[PDB]
DNA sequence: AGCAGCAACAGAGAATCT
């Protein structure tokens, strides 16, 4: 029953494993669980949009509400999950979600009213709302308009312009905050503390630093790094050297390599470094924000220089942010800051 | 709490019919004097309403009225486990979720059991009916249903008229027209085939086709209908049961 | 000559409208043959194969030319054109109204007093289709048949590298000129190793009898990977007349192994 | 119990006194309704502006408490097709009412989403059956309505919520509800809102849930801004003249302490960095011209994902370049 | 075809006189401006005008009919200086509750009906109109691309 | 052949000894094991790297597969038809064999493996480049509702076109191109177990020179020259090249020879010809920019807007369909700067 | 050779019902102590298996076993001229490419006589029955029907298990659940009725109602129904035949596997 | 690369007649 469950979770990979189950496991997104706390002793939930960047904990968050609310046994019984592996066309937000929002609310049995508040609700989640096409969202307005007394509904997305005006009115939106060293290193270090992961000073702080806002990346990078400590068993700690290697990070040398080639250097001589480059298998858009910070952090290019650097690297990534060559967007980004 | 046990699930299987179709949600409510139903169709020009007594069940107890509405859809799908002959035993708690219907052959042998979910409906009940209606009359429900048959593929509407001991349905469309005629008669050698008529005043009212077709299936509950017009209210077209009543009020085309 | 009833109540047949796209009136102001135009074009509700025909005619077309610039500022327009298109099966089509105006692009671009002539247009794209369609089966089926065979020759072979990469060296492989081998031994291995790749792509090599009294029932790869490969046609008939003596050659080793 | 219900649910305007914001056009409909003529209506209007609200308190006020019965109300919800008007709101024009006496009312709520079918054959039963029934199309965007349809009805354009009316509402609010409010957090809620009641009920039962208190304490501006997610015109006014007047460095290590002390997003400072340039007399329109394509790309890139810092970047280098045009 | 202005003033004077209303000639004006050749629509106006103020008058039609929304569309596009442009735009369409899809498809429809300018300049304006659709119906409408969409119309009649 | 000497385990790996290392960390505790996505240089290995590490995660039987056939149901009654790669131990999926009907057959298929679940099994994703964002959308909770019974190990060449979410819900692990000695090592294993007679050893290094890293095309283009030079390779055997890139280059010579709208035509029908024979449009695109950049007539300002305009339509074909008409479009701005 | 006639077409008219709609093909195999005939689902969930002896025509000549296979459509639109009385004589050589079915009326008059196209299939006749099975039971094959149509519309999976003394059927879906609970008892007023139960350890299986749906088609064949059950095995659903029997053997559901 | 609206065909169930 309950071993199994704790088993399970214990041979299962870190970002399953620490999952939170409480609305006190959230640790940066204080804001909206602090509303998610004091409505839990009221019962008057209002029908929620989390939107914000991805790994932010939303569905962690409204998973813990949804526990904290109704408890294991009515878990199963006063949800509708909806994600986007199902169909959500017109004729299923008509048919299904409707015919559960007219439903009445299960009872509760004797267990339940006793631990926990057990509202007189359920609760509809959409997760990854940015599939839905906007006809079939605005047939989610009225059933949700005026059903609220026996159902609440929770959408969830990344993009809120997606997601149509009218029902980003209905629901009170709450943007999660991007979780960067300062406000998830409290998590990351209970993480490794629990799992005996034995790092240096400033390597936790560097991973989510390479996260850029983003705790599961960065839990899975510790694992990686606590997996590959393990095997080689010489029991030193973690190196950020280390961490970067594994995270896909173009070490500083060949970052310097690049700035020289730039900076001195005509087409030629580019594109030929550019092509042996691109045999290292390295993602382009790790290499354009290096780039952009080390252009932008320098203190020795004029202003003038750096208006059109900051412009070309936001047009590059731009670019790549929509499934084009890595190699010719980079060859003509290196090739256009060259020219300045 | 609802507790109602059918000697045959045969009747409530019937009952359910006459909702079939023609309206999606119905709200029924169980208290001290028996049963009642009512379900109205979308486009609200009729109002299906049931009501059955205590007596017409082998074991009914209620210490607290309880409301439930759903989807008949859902319920006649259920409904054909019945056997006709099997005994059927509806059952609710106070604040219910779902609606228990328990069908059980006279030996233990087998049980069929069902949980039937709930929908919430704003508890409204109509109460349209009239003191007086202009005339009242009523004819073997068979009769009926075959004036109905006969027009319905004629028009997509049918009039009732209605002068001193005359009754004509008519119906008049593409191909042409047709008219049904039937007189006040008592049968002696029988009088469950007579046709009565009440008139304080003569009626002439149209009916949608396609509700008055709905409305015969109450012929399967009773042998006769009454038909009860009025140019002030809904027509009222009703199948009386042991203990009870299937009644239907049709708005006329205006 | 019977047309004045079709004046009277039929539209203009979208091949009339590409060449109207291209005419140029001295005798009319340019304002009034746009308006005419762009009506023309949106009564006729089919805005994408008057696109077509336009993309289709233009190459042909007279056009003043400084440096064929006019081409890459009628390319960005297709481009906004397909983006549309594709729009179109995601979004409410509030979007089709702009499509008529991409037509009316060459008008004001390639419109002029020389294009006289009608001239006449075929469908080269839903052939093309058919025979994309037609080489993307052969590869599916191809890419099938290594699944089954090659264990793990499969998890390496992406459709791409399957057509560009694979399949042109394996058909330049059976291809080869076996008569300038003098060595019997070295033409026998070849041939063994080549009996193996033709197994292990499940290659069957079927004797076309369907030949008119002609005594030469050619021999054909079963799939046709030639379809599939052969893009030139100047070589395709030198391939044929050395695959023929290699394919006998090639069957009777299969027959001699079997 | 109403006391389940979200604020925005449980504010619901029940009678047409509670409609605040329109008086143009509720003064004219309830003038329609006691002289009689009550014509077609199409409510057109943003979200949030008090269509539905508006059109049920009428209702209520025509045919009394028992308005679920004598109205038929379809919206998107609803299967709404040509077979569904031919036969639902044909035989609903047609018949008369089962419960009193009087004209009918359908209420096709969000009626851009319905097919050009269904509105073709509708715009003949409105004309065909106008002696015993209305209409009343609700919308929010007047590009799906066919021409003709849209004809037939007289078109109520429901403005934005005012100042004084959502002041009003939230007034009535904050007597409702044992909550204080702060003038300056009352300014800074009705500059959040955009003239959208939900918004403003959604945020303010949020704050209340914020307060941590048992409600003897006042909300504040801080309050509002931290459960928004809001950046604070302070915070604003620093980064854009840390943008335009200080270094390049600077201004980069500005923006990101900024953003990352409270927590702020780079599109909510686009927006609120363009409300503020908005109000700048500026020299030959070219600079403007500059500021505001880059500024609609970068939220364009922003609206599909990217790195925050390239994007924070770009938004520098844009307006500084496009300043510097200005000399 | 369209019915010209004597022929539905005719008809509204004719209406007036068999119902006995208060008018003005600037309201009736005004009615059949807002009309725009639509008789039904030029009486449902008139008879709501009644039924709501009891005097015709330009005043009472403006402020219970709004003016043609096409129209302010066309001013606001037609501008020579961009911050004439942006007034318009802020004031009267989105400090009145018009919706960004209303705003740029009624200015796809004014630009496409255009006659004051050239052809050129009309492709490329309606090209401008079209992007900012794009963007629009991809849930990033906003005020900021409409801003954008008009300077950038602006920069192509800056030759 | 390539497929005849190819690695079946980690310790038979001969190139990227620190990738090796990370792998068997990797699979040193297998259970405890998030998805994975191998991303790198086409032609560099992972494909077999990840099957050596499934090797090590489970006995030797997981080269022992068997392909299969599922057929599914859209809205039509059509049945899309896909063939699946089953493995007693794993199951390898390609959406890339169909069109936007990606998501109906993840969805499905992952929902039915995942249902019937050492004691997981793993799920390899061949190309996930080609899988729509809806498809990704859609495979993004399910990666994450069952974690305990299916694992993904998606096999990529570059990781532009996979969305952010995808991103962060697996591991990333880089697989860079052999070093041009490390090419030339194997190429000489090979040779010797194959029995070809080399004059020179360099050779073999020119075939690296002439691969760009890619191991899959060096041993064929071996093989394919050791058939021509009769088992006997000389100091100046010939490359053989294949025939696109021939028919690109000659493309290429004439943009740089003629720039006209008759040329315009026949650069058309020669783009027509080559996409009707199962090539892709970007690697079309891709091969023709870097050829026409190495044009030593042209300049830097003309190689420049070579590049922008290469770069322009890249993301033009990315995101349209008919990939002529964006083609078509690059050659004729290409015209036009030239 | 093929010989065998029924002296009833009815008879095999009611067995091809059997196998009817829930699959496609079907290789039946004639020997000297009768024809069986075995069935494969696309899915391979479900296996149709018949047995008649010898015992069970009227006339049975068979001097070299004959395997044939043919398509179940085919056969069951030529299966309705049988007009139940009408004597069947099912005839083929021992290399066949068709099936000749034989219908006579008692006097010479009417002789419908079909020759069908058979598909030919690699023979492999599974062997999938268990020695013992975890539970056994039987009941009215009418009352089995009633059970599973039940159920079925609640879910497409009902469970059965069983506990000593205790069979239960159990569905649950959207709209609710639903359950029949049967007992064990002998009905001397007539056995036929009785509900038999044989127990060695408790149950507890998961099948698709599809299939449950396809095998109750059987009722027509037999009063009873046996079931037995085993958690290492497909389930056997059995309807007896004088001098024979119809078998269905059905996969349980992994968790989705009808 | 939805939906919808459709319309037509096939299958199942119910009623009537022999
Ligand atoms: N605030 C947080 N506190 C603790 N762990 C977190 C937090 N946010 C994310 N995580 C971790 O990241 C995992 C993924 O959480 P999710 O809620 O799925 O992220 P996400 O916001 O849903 O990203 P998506 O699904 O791509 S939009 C969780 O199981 C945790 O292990
Ligand atoms: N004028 C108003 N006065 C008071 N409350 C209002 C007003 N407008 C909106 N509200 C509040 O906002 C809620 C929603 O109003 P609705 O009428 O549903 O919005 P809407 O105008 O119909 O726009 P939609 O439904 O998105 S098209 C109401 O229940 C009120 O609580
Ligand atoms: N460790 C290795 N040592 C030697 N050759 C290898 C090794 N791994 C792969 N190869 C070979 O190098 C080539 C790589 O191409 P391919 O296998 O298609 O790459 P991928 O595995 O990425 O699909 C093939 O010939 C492959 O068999
Ligand atoms: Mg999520
Ligand atoms: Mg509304």
């Known amino acids: 029953s309950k071993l199994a469950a704790e088993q399970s979770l214990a041979q299962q990979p870190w970002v399953e494993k620490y999952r939170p189950k409480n609305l006190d496991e959230v640790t940066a997104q204080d804001h909206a669980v602090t509303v998610l706390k004091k409505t839990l002793k009221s019962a008057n939930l209002p029908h929620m949009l989390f939107y914000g960047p991805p790994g932010t904990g939303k569905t962690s968050t409204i998973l813990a509400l949804t526990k904290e609310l109704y408890g294991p046994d009515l878990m199963k019984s006063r949800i509708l999950e909806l994600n986007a592996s199902d169909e959500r066309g017109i004729s299923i937000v008509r048919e299904k979600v409707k015919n559960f929002a007219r439903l009445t609310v299960s009872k509760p049995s004797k267990h339940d009213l006793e631990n926990y508040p057990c509202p007189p609700y359920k609760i509809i989640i959409l997760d990854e709302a940015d599939s839905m096409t906007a006809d079939a969202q605005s047939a989610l307005r009225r059933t949700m308009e005026t059903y609220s007394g026996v159902t609440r509904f929770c959408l969830i997305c990344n993009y809120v312009t997606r997601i149509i005006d009218p029902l980003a009115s209905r629901c009170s939106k709450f943007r999660f905050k991007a979780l960067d060293a300062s406000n998830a290193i409290d998590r990351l270090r209970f993480i490794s503390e629990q799992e005996n992961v034995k790092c240096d000073d400033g390597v936790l702080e560097r991973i989510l630093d390479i996260s850029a806002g983003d705790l599961r990346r960065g839990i899975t990078l510790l694992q990686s790094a606590s997996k590959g400590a393990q095997y080689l068993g010489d029991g030193k700690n973690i190196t950020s050297t280390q961490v970067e290697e594994l995270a896909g990070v173009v070490p500083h040398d060949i970052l310097i390599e690049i700035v020289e080639k730039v900076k001195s250097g005509d087409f030629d001589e580019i594109k030929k470094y550019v092509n042996t480059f691109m045999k290292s298998g390295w993602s382009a858009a790790s290499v354009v924000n290096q780039l952009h910070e080390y252009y932008i952090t320098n203190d020795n290019f004029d202003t003038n220089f750096k208006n059109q650097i900051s412009w070309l690297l936001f047009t590059t990534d731009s670019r790549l942010n929509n499934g084009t060559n890595e190699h010719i967007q980079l060859l003509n980004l290196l090739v256009k800051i060259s020219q300045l | 709490m609802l507790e109602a046990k059918f000697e045959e699930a045969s009747l409530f299987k019937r009952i359910i019919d006459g909702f079939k179709d023609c309206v999606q949600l119905v709200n029924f409510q169980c208290k001290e004097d028996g049963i009642i139903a009512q379900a109205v169709d979308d486009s609200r020009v009729l109002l299906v309403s049931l009501e059955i007594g205590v007596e017409a069940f082998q074991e009914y107890r209620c210490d607290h009225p309880v409301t439930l509405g759903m989807d008949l859809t859902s319920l006649s799908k259920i409904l054909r486990c019945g056997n006709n002959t099997d005994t059927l035993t509806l059952i609710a708690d106070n604040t219910p979720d779902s609606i228990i219907l328990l069908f059980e052959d006279t030996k233990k042998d087998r049980i069929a059991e069902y949980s039937l979910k709930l929908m919430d409906i704003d508890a409204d009940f109509l109460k349209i009916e009239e003191l007086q209606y202009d005339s009242t009359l009523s004819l073997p429900s068979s009769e009926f249903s075959k004036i109905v048959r006969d027009l319905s593929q004629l028009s997509d509407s049918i009039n009732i008229m209605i002068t001193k001991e005359t009754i004509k349905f008519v119906a008049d469309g593409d191909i042409g027209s047709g008219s049904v005629i039937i007189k006040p008669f008592v049968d002696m050698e029988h009088p469950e085939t007579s046709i009565k008529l009440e008139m304080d005043q003569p009626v002439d009212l149209t009916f949608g086709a396609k509700y008055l077709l709905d409305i015969i299936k109450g012929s399967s509950l009773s042998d006769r209908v009454g038909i009860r017009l009025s140019s002030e209210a809904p027509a009222l077209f009703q199948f009386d049961l042991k203990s009870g009543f299937l009644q239907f009020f049709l708005a006329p085309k205006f | 000559n019977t047309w004045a009833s079709s004046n009277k109540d039929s539209p203009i047949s979208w091949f009339k409208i590409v060449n109207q796209l291209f005419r140029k009136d001295p005798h009319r102001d340019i304002k009034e043959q746009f308006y005419e135009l762009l009506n023309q074009v949106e009564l006729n509700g089919n805005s994408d194969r008057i696109l077509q025909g336009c993309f289709n005619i233009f190459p042909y077309v007279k056009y003043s030319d400084n440096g064929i610039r006019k081409p890459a500022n009628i390319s960005d327009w297709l481009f906004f054109h397909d983006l549309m298109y594709q729009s179109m099966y995601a979004h409410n089509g509030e979007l089709l109204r702009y499509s008529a105006l991409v037509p009316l692009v060459f008008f004001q671009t390639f419109g002029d007093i020389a294009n006289k002539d009608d001239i006449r247009m075929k469908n080269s794209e839903y052939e093309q289709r058919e025979l994309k369609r037609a080489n993307s089966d052969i590869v599916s089926l191809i890419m099938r048949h290594i699944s089954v065979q090659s264990p793990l020759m499969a998890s390496f072979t992406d459709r791409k590298s399957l057509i560009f990469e694979i399949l042109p060296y394996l058909d330049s492989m059976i291809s080869s000129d076996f008569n300038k081998i003098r060595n019997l031994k070295l033409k026998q291995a070849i041939m063994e190793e080549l009996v193996q790749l033709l197994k292990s792509f499940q290659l069957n090599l079927i004797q076309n009898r369907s030949e008119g009294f002609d005594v030469r029932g050619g021999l054909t790869i079963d799939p046709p990977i030639d379809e599939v490969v052969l893009l030139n046609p100047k070589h395709i008939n030198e391939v044929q007349h050395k695959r023929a003596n290699n394919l006998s050659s090639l069957l009777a080793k299969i027959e001699e192994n079997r | 119990s109403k006391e389940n219900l979200p604020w925005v649910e449980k504010y619901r305007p029940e009678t047409l006194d509670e409609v605040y914001g329109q008086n143009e056009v509720i003064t004219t409909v309830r003038k329609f309704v006691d002289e009689g003529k009550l014509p077609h209506l199409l409510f057109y209007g943003p979200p949030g502006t008090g269509k539905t609200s508006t059109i049920v308190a009428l209702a209520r006020e025509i045919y009394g408490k028992n308005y679920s019965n004598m109205v038929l109300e379809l919206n998107a919800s609803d299967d709404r097709g040509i077979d569904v008007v031919r036969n639902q709101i044909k035989d609903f024009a047609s018949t008369r009412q089962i419960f009193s006496k009087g004209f009918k009312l359908i209420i096709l709520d969000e009626a851009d989403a319905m097919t050009n079918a269904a509105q073709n054959a509708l715009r003949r039963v409105i004309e065909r059956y106008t002696k015993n029934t209305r209409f009343c199309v609700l919308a929010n965007y007047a590009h799906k309505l066919t021409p003709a349809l849209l004809s037939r009805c007289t078109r109520f354009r429901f403005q934005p919520l005012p100042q004084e009316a959502i002041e009003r509402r939230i007034a009535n609010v904050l007597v409702h509800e044992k909550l204080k409010l702060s003038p300056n957090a009352e300014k800074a809620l009705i500059e959040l809102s955009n003239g959208d009641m939900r918004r403003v009920l959604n945020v303010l039962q949020s704050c209340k849930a914020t307060l941590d208190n048992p409600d003897e304490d006042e909300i504040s501006d801080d309050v509002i801004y931290e459960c928004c997610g809001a950046p604070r015109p302070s915070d604003l006014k620093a980064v854009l003249k840390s943008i335009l007047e200080d270094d390049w460095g600077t201004a980069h290590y500005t923006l990101n302490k900024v953003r990352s002390a409270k927590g702020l997003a780079l599109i909510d400072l686009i927006e609120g960095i363009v409300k503020i340039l908005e109000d700048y007399e500026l020299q030959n329109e070219e600079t403007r011209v500059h500021l505001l394509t880059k500024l609609a790309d970068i939220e364009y890139s922003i609206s599909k994902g990217g790195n925050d810092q390239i994007q924070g970047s770009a938004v520098i280098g844009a307006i500084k370049a496009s300043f510097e045009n200005e000399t | 075809s369209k019915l010209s202005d004597e022929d539905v003033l005719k008809r509204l004077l004719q209406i007036i006189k068999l119902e006995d209303v208060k008018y003005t000639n600037d309201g009736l004006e005004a009615i059949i401006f807002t009309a725009e050749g639509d008789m039904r629509q030029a009486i449902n106006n008139l008879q709501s005008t009644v039924a709501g103020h009891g005097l015709v008058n330009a005043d009472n039609v403006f402020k219970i009919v709004d003016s043609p929304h096409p129209l302010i569309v066309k001013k606001m596009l037609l501008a020579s200086n961009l911050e004439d442009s942006i007034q318009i735009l802020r004031t009267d369409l989105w400090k009145k509750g018009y919706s960004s899809i209303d705003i740029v498809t009624t200015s796809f429809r004014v630009t496409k009906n255009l006659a004051q300018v050239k052809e050129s300049v009309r492709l490329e304006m309606i090209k401008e109109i079209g992007l900012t659709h794009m963007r629009i119906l991809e849930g990033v409408g906003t005020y900021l691309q409409l801003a954008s969409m008009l300077a950038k119309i602006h920069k192509l009649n800056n030759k | ?338």
Not at chain 6, 289 to 318: A, C, G, M, P, Q
């Open chain 6, 1 to 338: 052949w390539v497929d005849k000497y190819r690695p079946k385990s980690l310790n038979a790996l001969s190139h990227n000894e620190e990738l090796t290392n990370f792998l068997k960390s990797l699979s040193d505790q297998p259970r405890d094991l998030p998805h994975l996505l191998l991303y790198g240089p086409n032609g560099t290995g992972k494909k077999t790297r990840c099957m050596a590490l499934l090797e090590s995660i489970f006995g030797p039987g997981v080269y022992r597969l068997k392909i299969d056939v599922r057929q599914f149901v859209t809205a039509s009654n059509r049945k899309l038809e896909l063939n699946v790669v089953s493995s007693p131990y794993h199951l390898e999926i390609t959406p890339s064999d169909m069109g936007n009907n990606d998501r109906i057959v993840i969805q499905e298929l992952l929902k039915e493996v995942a249902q019937m679940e050492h004691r997981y099994k793993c799920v390899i994703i061949n190309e996930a480049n080609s899988l729509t964002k809806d498809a990704q959308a859609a495979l993004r909770r399910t990666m994450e509702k069952y974690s305990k019974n299916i694992r993904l190990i998606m096999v990529c060449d570059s990781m532009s076109p996979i969305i952010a979410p995808i991103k962060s819900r697996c591991l990333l692990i880089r697989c860079p191109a052999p070093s041009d000695s490390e090419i030339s090592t194997i190429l000489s294993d090979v040779v010797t177990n194959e029995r070809i007679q080399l004059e020179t050893k360099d050779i073999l290094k020119r075939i690296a020179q002439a691969s760009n890293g890619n191991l899959r095309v060096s041993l064929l283009m071996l093989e394919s020259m050791a058939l021509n030079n009769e088992l006997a390779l000389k100091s100046s055997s010939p490359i053989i090249k294949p025939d696109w890139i021939i028919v690109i280059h000659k493309l290429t010579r004439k943009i740089v020879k003629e720039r006209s709208v008759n040329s315009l035509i026949e650069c058309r029908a020669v783009l027509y010809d080559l996409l009707a024979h199962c090539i892709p449009a970007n690697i079309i695109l891709k091969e023709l920019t870097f050829s026409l950049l190495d044009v030593e007539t042209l300049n830097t300002t003309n190689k420049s807007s070579i590049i922008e305009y290469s770069s322009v339509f890249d993301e033009r074909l990315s995101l349209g369909n008919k990939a002529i008409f964006h083609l078509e479009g690059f050659i004729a701005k290409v015209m036009c700067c030239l």
